[PDB]
Amino acid sequence: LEAKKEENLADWYSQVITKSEMIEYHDISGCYILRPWAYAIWEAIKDFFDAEIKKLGVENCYFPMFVSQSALEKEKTHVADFAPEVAWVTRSGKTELAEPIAIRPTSETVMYPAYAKWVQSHRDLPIKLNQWCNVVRWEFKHPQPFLRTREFLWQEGHSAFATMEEAAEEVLQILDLYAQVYEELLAIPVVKGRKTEKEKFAGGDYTTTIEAFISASGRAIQGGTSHHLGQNFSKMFEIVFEDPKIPGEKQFAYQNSWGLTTRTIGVMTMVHGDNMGLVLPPRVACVQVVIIPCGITNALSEEDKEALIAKCNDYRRRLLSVNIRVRADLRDNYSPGWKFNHWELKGVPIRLEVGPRDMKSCQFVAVRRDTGEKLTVAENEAETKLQAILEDIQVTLFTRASEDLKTHMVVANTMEDFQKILDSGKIVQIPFCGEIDCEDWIKKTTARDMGAKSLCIPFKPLCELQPGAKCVCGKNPAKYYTLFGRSY
Amino acid sequence: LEAKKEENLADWYSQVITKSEMIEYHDISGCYILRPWAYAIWEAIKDFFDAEIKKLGVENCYFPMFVSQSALEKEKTHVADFAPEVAWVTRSGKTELAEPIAIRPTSETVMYPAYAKWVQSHRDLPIKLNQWCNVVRWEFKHPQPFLRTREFLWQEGHSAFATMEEAAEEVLQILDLYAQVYEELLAIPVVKGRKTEKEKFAGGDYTTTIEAFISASGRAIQGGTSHHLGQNFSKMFEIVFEDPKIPGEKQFAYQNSWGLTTRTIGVMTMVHGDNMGLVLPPRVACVQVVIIPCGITNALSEEDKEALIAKCNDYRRRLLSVNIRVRADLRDNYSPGWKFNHWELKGVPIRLEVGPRDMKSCQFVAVRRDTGEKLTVAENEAETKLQAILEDIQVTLFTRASEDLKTHMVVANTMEDFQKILDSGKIVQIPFCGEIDCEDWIKKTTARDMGAKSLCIPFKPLCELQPGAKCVCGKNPAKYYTLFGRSY
Numbered sequence: 013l014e015a016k017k018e019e020n021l022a023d024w025y026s027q028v029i030t031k032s033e034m035i036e037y038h039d040i041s042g043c044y045i046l047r048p049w050a051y052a053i054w055e056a057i058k059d060f061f062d063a064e065i066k067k068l069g070v071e072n073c074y075f076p077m078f079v080s081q082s083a084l085e086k087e088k089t090h091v092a093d094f095a096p097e098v099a100w101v102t103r104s105g106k107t108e109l110a111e112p113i114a115i116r117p118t119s120e121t122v123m124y125p126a127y128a129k130w131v132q133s134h135r136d137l138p139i140k141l142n143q144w145c146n147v148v149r150w151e152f153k154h155p156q157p158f159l160r161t162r163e164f165l166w167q168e169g170h171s172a173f174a175t176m177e178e179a180a181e182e183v184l185q186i187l188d189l190y191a192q193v194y195e196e197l198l199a200i201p202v203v204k205g206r207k208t209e210k211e212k213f214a215g216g217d218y219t220t221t222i223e224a225f226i227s228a229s230g231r232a233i234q235g236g237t238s239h240h241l242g243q244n245f246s247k248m249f250e251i252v253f254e255d256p257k258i259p260g261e262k263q264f265a266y267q268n269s270w271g272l273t274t275r276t277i278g279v280m281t282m283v284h285g286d287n288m289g290l291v292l293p294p295r296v297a298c299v300q301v302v303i304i305p306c307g308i309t310n311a312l313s314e315e316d317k318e319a320l321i322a323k324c325n326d327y328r329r330r331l332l333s334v335n336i337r338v339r340a341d342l343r344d345n346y347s348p349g350w351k352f353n354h355w356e357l358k359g360v361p362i363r364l365e366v367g368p369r370d371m372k373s374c375q376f377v378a379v380r381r382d383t384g385e386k387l388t389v390a391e392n393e394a395e396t397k398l399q400a401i402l403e404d405i406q407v408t409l410f411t412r413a414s415e416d417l418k419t420h421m422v423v424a425n426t427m428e429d430f431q432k433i434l435d436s437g438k439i440v441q442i443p444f445c446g447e448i449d450c451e452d453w454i455k456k457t458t459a460r461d462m463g464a465k466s467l468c469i470p471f472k473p474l475c476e477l478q479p480g481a482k483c484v485c486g487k488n489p490a491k492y493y494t495l496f497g498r499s500y
Numbered sequence: 501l502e503a504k505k506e507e508n509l510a511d512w513y514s515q516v517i518t519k520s521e522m523i524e525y526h527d528i529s530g531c532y533i534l535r536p537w538a539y540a541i542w543e544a545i546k547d548f549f550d551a552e553i554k555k556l557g558v559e560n561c562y563f564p565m566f567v568s569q570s571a572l573e574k575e576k577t578h579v580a581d582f583a584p585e586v587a588w589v590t591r592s593g594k595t596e597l598a599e600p601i602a603i604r605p606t607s608e609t610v611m612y613p614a615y616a617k618w619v620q621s622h623r624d625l626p627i628k629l630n631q632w633c634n635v636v637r638w639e640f641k642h643p644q645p646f647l648r649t650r651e652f653l654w655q656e657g658h659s660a661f662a663t664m665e666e667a668a669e670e671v672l673q674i675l676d677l678y679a680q681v682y683e684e685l686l687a688i689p690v691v692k693g694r695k696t697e698k699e700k701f702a703g704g705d706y707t708t709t710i711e712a713f714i715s716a717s718g719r720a721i722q723g724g725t726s727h728h729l730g731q732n733f734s735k736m737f738e739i740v741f742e743d744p745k746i747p748g749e750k751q752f753a754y755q756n757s758w759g760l761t762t763r764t765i766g767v768m769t770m771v772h773g774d775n776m777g778l779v780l781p782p783r784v785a786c787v788q789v790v791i792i793p794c795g796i797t798n799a800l801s802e803e804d805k806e807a808l809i810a811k812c813n814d815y816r817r818r819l820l821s822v823n824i825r826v827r828a829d830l831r832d833n834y835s836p837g838w839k840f841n842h843w844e845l846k847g848v849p850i851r852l853e854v855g856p857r858d859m860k861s862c863q864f865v866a867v868r869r870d871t872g873e874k875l876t877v878a879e880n881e882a883e884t885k886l887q888a889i890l891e892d893i894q895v896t897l898f899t900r901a902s903e904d905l906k907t908h909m910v911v912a913n914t915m916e917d918f919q920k921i922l923d924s925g926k927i928v929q930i931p932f933c934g935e936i937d938c939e940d941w942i943k944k945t946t947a948r949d950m951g952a953k954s955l956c957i958p959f960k961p962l963c964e965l966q967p968g969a970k971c972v973c974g975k976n977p978a979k980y981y982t983l984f985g986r987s988y
C-alpha cells in the first residue's frame with residue numbers, strides 16, 4: 013500500500029481497511045459502513061458462536077431496544093446509575109411527540125422487567141437468551157473503526173438461574189467460546205482472566221475477560237467479557253421465585269451477562285495484517301481460494317481461452333465439493349497481475365494460478381498469502397493439497413501470534429522493572445495489592461515516565477506469587493499477579 | 501384455548517401468539533418481544549433466502565440507519581417527499597446535542613450516496629447489497645403483532661445495474677424467492693402480480709408483489725415486494741458512469757428494491773392455526789418432532805424409568821442423524837398429558853410418544869399435529885417413516901391452503917357480482933380501467949355496501965379479458981383483470 017505498518021500504524025490501518033473494501037466512512041462519526049468483506053467475517057464468527065451457545069441451551073430472540081419515559085418516571089423498570097447516555101427521540105418530523113422515546117438505554121432496562129414477568133415458579137428456570145443487534149455510544153476521542161467505535165455490531169447474552177453454581181458454570185463456558193473465537197477462528201492467542209475491582213462491571217459481582225495483545229502499537233485489547241451479576245439485578249427488578257426446599261421465603265435469581273463485538277475484526281487486522289495489506293485466517297475468510305487464469309496473451313487462441321476457463325471452473329466445482337470457499341476471477345477487464353494484487357490486499361489465503369503451460373503438464377500453482385510461498389500442485393491432488401495448505405496457514409498465523417504473546421508478556425517484580433519493560437512496548441504481569449487507588453496511581457505514574465491499565469488477573473499467571481512479595485506500590489502486600497499494559 | 505378462531509379471530513390470534521410463547525407485549529405499542537419460538541421461524545426463512553440470493557450474487561452488509569441534519573440541509577443526500585416520518589434524536593440525557601441525528605429516515609437516504617461514490621466506471625457494476633435489520637414506523641390504528649406493526653424485523657435488498665434488462669431480471673427472480681418462502685417454507689399459496697398505479701411504490705417505475713389470502717378474516721395480505729426503480733434515484737443521487745459504446749454522455753444506473761418482513765409469521769399463524777392453537781409447517785418448525793415419555797406411574801420401576809429415558813434418547817440421536825429437528829421433553833415436573841397440550845399449542849408437527857407397553861413390542865407412536873392422526877411405528881423404521889410424515893404434513897398444509905385460495909378467489913365481470921362476491925368473504929378478479937380515481941371510487945363504494953383495495957394485477961389471470969369488456973366503473977374500457985379485496 014502507501015503506508016508501512018511499522019512506520020505509521022494509524023495510516024496503515026486506515027488504508028488497509030478501506031482498500032480491502034471492508035469499511036466505508038459514513039456521514040456520521042464513529043459510525044461506518046460494514047461492507048460484505050468485513051461483514052462476512054462477522055457472519056463466520058456469528059455462525060460458529062451461535063452454534064456453540066445453542067448446545068448450551070441459549071436461544072435467540074429480539075428485544076425492541078427503545079423505551080418510553082412513561083415507563084421510567086413510573087418505575088416499571090429502572091435506569092442504573094453507572095449508565096450514560098440515554099439519547100431521546102422527541103420529534104416525528106417537526107411535530108413533538110406525545111410519548112418521546114429513549115434509545116438504547118441499557119439491555120437491562122428493557123429485558124429484566126420481562127424476565128421478572130416470565131419467572132413465576134422454579135420451573136420457569138433457567139432463562140437463557142441471546143440477541144444479535146447493534147449498539148450506539150455517544151462519547152469519543154478519535155474513533156478508530158472496530159477498536160474504539162461509537163457504533164458497532166455485537167451479541168449479548170442474558171441468563172437467569174435458580175442457583176449460583178449454574179450461573180458460575182455458564183460464565184466460564186461462554187468465556188471459553190470467546191477464547192475459541194479468537195484462538196480458533198481468528199488464530200489470535202488470548203489471556204483468560206478476571207478483572208480487578210476497578211475495571212470490573214459495576215452492576216455485577218465479578219467480570220471475566222479475554223485479553224488479546226497487539227505488538228504493533230505495543231498495546232493490549234479486551235476481546236470479550238462474561239459477567240456474573242449475582243442477585244444485584246434480580247433484587248433491583250424483583251426477578252423472584254420460591255423453592256420448596258424452603259417453602260418459604262422468596263429467593264432471587266442469579267444472573268449473567270456476556271457480549272462479543274465486531275472489534276474482533278480490528279484485532280484480526282492489526283495482528284495478522286501485512287505491508288501488502290489484509291491477511292485473513294482461512295477459518296473466517298469469505299473466500300479462502302481465488303482461482304486466477306494466468307498467461308493470457310493478445311496472441312492467445314480462442315479455443316484455448318475457452319479451455320483455460322473450463323479448467324478454472326473444473327477446479328472451482330471440485331473445491332466446492334470439499335467445502336472450500338472458492339472464487340474464480342474470470343474477468344476480461346483486468347490484468348491477472350491486477351487480480352493478484354487485488355486479492356492479495358484483501359488477504360485471500362490461497363491464490364490458485366491456472367496457466368496453459370501448467371495446464372499442459374496437467375498441474376497448477378497455489379500461492380500462500382502469509383509466507384508468499386508458491387507450490388506447484390498436481391491437478392489430481394487439488395482437494396487434499398489445498399485443504400492441507402489452508403489448515404497449515406491457520407496454524408502458522410496462530411503460532412506466529414502466539415510467539416509474540418510469550419515474547420511481549422513478561423514478569424516484573426518491582427516498579428522500576430515494570431516501567432522499563434512497559435516502555436519497551438510489552439504488557440506486564442506484576443504483584444498487585446488489588447486496590448483501586450493503587451490502580452489509579454499506577455496509571456498516573458506510568459504515563460509520564462499514556463498510562464498502563466489493568467487488563468485481567470490471569471487464571472494462570474507465569475509465576476507463583478511468593479509469600480511476603482510486595483505490590484509495586486510498596487505500601488501493601490501483593491494479593492495476586494496482575495496483567496498490566498497500555499490498552500485500547 | 502379460550503377462543504374459537506371462527507367466533508373471535510382477534511382474541512383467538514392474541515391468545516395463540518401469547519400462549520405459544522411467540523411474542524410478549526412490550527412497554528411500547530406496536531412494539532413487541534420476539535421470543536425464540538417465533539424468532540426461530542424467522543431464522544429459518546432467513547437461512548433459506550440468504551442462501552438463494554447469494555447464488556444470485558447479492559452480498560450482505562451493514563448500514564448505520566441514522567443520519568445528521570448536517571447532511572440533509574447541505575444536500576449531501578436528499579429526503580424524498582412521499583416518505584414520512586423522520587424522528588430525530590435531540591437529547592443525550594438532558595443535554596441537547598451539537599449534532600442532533602435522524603432515525604431511519606429511509607434506506608435510500610443512507611445508502612445511495614455511497615452507491616454514487618462506489619460507482620466510478622462500468623466495471624464497478626452491478627452493485628447488489630442486502631441487509632437484515634429492524635425498521636420502525638410512527639403511525640398506527642390498532643397494531644396487530646406481525647400483520648400491521650409499528651416495529652418489525654425484515655431484510656431489504658438494493659441493487660444497481662448498467663442495463664435495464666439486468667435490473668428487470670433480478671426483480672422477477674427475487675419475487676419468486678419470496679413466492680417460495682411462502683409456498684415452500686410456509687406452505688402458503690400466493691398470487692404473483694404487478695401493483696396498480698395507485699398502490700405501487702412512488703419512487704419506482706413498477707412494483708411486483710406476492711399476495712396471500714386469509715380465509716379467516718376473508719382478507720388478503722401483501723407477502724413481499726420487488727420494486728424496479730429505474731433511474732429515478734440514480735438521477736436524484738448522481739449514481740452515474742460512462743459506457744464506451746458511447747464515449748460519451750453520462751448514463752444512469754438502473755436500480756432495484758426488495759423487502760420481506762416478519763409478517764410471514766402472522767400469515768402462517770392465520771392460515772394454518774387451529775382451535776388447539778399454533779400449527780407449524782415442518783419446513784420452519786424450531787422443533788419438528790417432540791419425544792414424550794408416556795406411561796409413567798407412581799408405581800413404575802426405577803430401572804424401567806432409566807430404560808424408558810434411554811430409549812427416548814436413542815430415538816433422539818437417530819433423528820438427529822437424519823437432520824430432523826428433535827426435542828425430548830424429559831421432565832419430572834409435568835404430566836405427559838401436560839406436555840402433550842404444551843407442544844400441541846406450540847404446533848410441533850409430530851408428537852413421538854414412547855411408552856413401556858410399546859417399548860416392549862419394540863415400537864412407538866407418532867402423532868400428527870395437523871390431522872391429529874396417530875400411527876404406530878416400528879423402532880427400525882424411525883428415520884424413514886418420520887421424515888415421510890413431515891413431508892406429508894408440509895404437503896397437506898399447502899394443499900389445504902391452496903384449496904382455500906381457488907375457492908375464495910373467483911372472477912366478477914360486473915360491479916353487482918363484485919359486491920355480492922366480496923361480501924361473501926372472498927377476493928375478486930375484475931375487469932379494471934387501471935385508473936387511480938376509479939380505484940379510489942371502488943374503495944369508497946364497496947365499503948358501505950371496510951373498502952375493497954387493489955391487490956395486484958396477476959401475471960396469470962383466471963380468465964382472458966374479452967375485447968370490449970368494460971371496467972366495473974362502466975365509464976371506461978377494461979385494461980386488465982385486476983385482483984381486488986379488503987386487505988390488511
Ligand SMILES: [Zn+2]
Pocket residue numbers: 444445446447450483484485486487488
Ligand atoms: Zn499497591
Ligand SMILES: [Zn+2]
Pocket residue numbers: 932933934935938971972973974975976
Ligand atoms: Zn373504471
